[PDB]
A = this chain, B = another copy of it.
Amino acid sequence: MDFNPSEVASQVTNYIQAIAAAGVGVLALAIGLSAAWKYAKRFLKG
């Protein structure tokens, strides 16, 4: 069993598409907000 460990490269990688997103990916709703958060202060700052 050697073809096994390669086909597996498919096993980390499918676990990763959304995952890589968890900090960066759902967060864009709150994170752009860090940007949106800027405007929060400038209307105040202008």
Contact = CB atoms under 8 A, between A and B. Distances in A.
B13 A25 contact: no
Copies of this protein in the complex: 35
Interface of A: 1-2, 4-6, 8-13, 15-46
Given A1-B17, A16-B39, A17-B1, A9 B33 contact: no
B43 A23 contact: yes
Nearest to A2: B15
A23 B11 CA distance: 11
A2 B21 CA distance: 7
- The listed residue with most B CB atoms (<10 A of its CB), out of A16, A17, A30, A40, is A40
A2 B24 CA distance: 9
